[PDB]
Amino acid sequence: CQEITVPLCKGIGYNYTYMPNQFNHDTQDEAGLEVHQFWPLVEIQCSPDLKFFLCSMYTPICLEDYKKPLPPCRSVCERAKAGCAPLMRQYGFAWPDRMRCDRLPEQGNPDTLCMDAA
């Protein structure tokens, strides 16, 4: 575990993250340098979930009781894409292929455990 160092992800839901991340980053600063390219889309606040999904993906949570990775559920990703995606595509920004939502576990499975609201 390490401590969240990226501004946008402080107080996103967890204070502890691991490295390397799902994006294969050395330091938290490296993951922040990449997630910062979304800052426009963040300021627009095109989706409330976008910040949580992108922060669970670039600096995933690190827990001292659960040592298996914990990704956001597929619905959170599909919701951030549903809300944010139309503007970015309309301006030529594809939902990033690493961020694809069919690559994530779905909520409601003890085997596929994820983070979401009920």
Binding site: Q37, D65, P110, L113, M115
Partner: protein, 316 residues
């Protein structure tokens, strides 16, 4: 002064400090050999110590070639990764070819593992321990180099895409070790397909060896530097033979029932037990696998446990 002219003092040294890492490598190799043969009649019944004593694998069987190879590859891999990591100054790793442009839209870089360092040390120690001049020692040397270059050849260019917003348009690449699993599978195949050496009946008269010998093994050394070399046929692994360190097949776990078990593993119970005459005895108890997990909303991940029945049989 770890890296010095190495003639008088300090230099010519630096052999004991590495022996631990080398032993760890050979242990990883032995564990992988045990993995590759987990459900076969020969299941890599080898210790780390034994590959120095040569006791328990003096049989120039198909499986000893693989054992030699996989242990040389394990030692080389482990010491190459020790060197490559910073535990030993990263040895400034494979700095050659770094920075150049390797293709359209990607460049070399990162810290490529200094494989030639690991190979150098592994040769220095492992081939030293391979004492004797007989044909079997040449076979073992062959299989050793076979595993060292199996570890080397398996190195692959791994990359990280550092383009705009993460696009793989531009990316930095380095040369990384492969997964130890793929090397284990490779040596598994090499064991399944090891081959016996010359086995020549004529053997040019060598009662006195000053002129005889030292040429026989010379002609028996045209063997694939990837392939493992063995001379004797492999014994029957159904049977116990305490002279060879073979503990027999009785009492060995096999896999009978299994959702996703290899036909090899599913047949393993008949092959080790039923094909060898022994009977199949079971175990009352059952295993457990976490289940009923309830990832609380936000911040907390909490997962409950479940219980399930494992399957296996014992050639009792």
């Amino acid at each position: 002064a770890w890296s010095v002219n190495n003639f008088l003092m300090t230099g010519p040294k630096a052999y004991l400090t590495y022996s631990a890492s080398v032993a760890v490598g050979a242990q990883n190799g032995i564990e992988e050999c045990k993995y590759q043969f987990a459900w076969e009649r020969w299941n890599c019944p080898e210790s780390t110590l034994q590959l120095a004593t040569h006791n328990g694998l003096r049989s120039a069987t198909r499986e000893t070639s693989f054992v030699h190879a996989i242990s040389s590859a394990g030692v080389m891999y482990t010491l190459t990764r020790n060197c490559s990591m910073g535990d030993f100054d990263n040895c400034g790793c494979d700095d050659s070819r770094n920075g150049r442009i390797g293709g359209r839209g990607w460049v070399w870089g990162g810290c490529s593992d200094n494989a030639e360092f690991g190979e150098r040390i592994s040769k220095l120690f492992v081939d030293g321990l391979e004492t004797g001049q007989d044909a079997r020692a040449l076979m073992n040397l062959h299989n050793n180099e076979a595993g060292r270059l199996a570890v080397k050849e398996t190195m692959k260019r791994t990359c990280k895409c550092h383009g705009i917003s993460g696009s793989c348009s531009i990316q930095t690449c380095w040369l990384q070790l492969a997964e130890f699993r793929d090397i284990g599978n490779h040596l598994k195949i090499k064991h399944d397909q090891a081959l016996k050496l010359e086995m020549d009946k004529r053997k040019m008269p060598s009662t006195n060896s000053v002129n005889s010998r030292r040429a026989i093994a010379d002609a028996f050394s045209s063997v694939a530097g990837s392939e493992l070399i063995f001379l004797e046929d492999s014994p029957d692994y159904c049977l116990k033979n305490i002279s060879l360190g073979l503990q027999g097949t009785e009492g060995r776990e096999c896999l009978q029932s299994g959702k996703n078990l290899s036909q090899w593993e599913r047949r393993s119970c008949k092959r080790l037990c039923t094909d060898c005459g022994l009977r199949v005895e079971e175990k009352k108890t059952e295993i457990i696998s976490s289940c009923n997990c309830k990832f609380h909303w936000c911040c907390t991940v909490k997962c409950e446990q479940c219980k399930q029945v494992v399957i296996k049989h014992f050639c009792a």
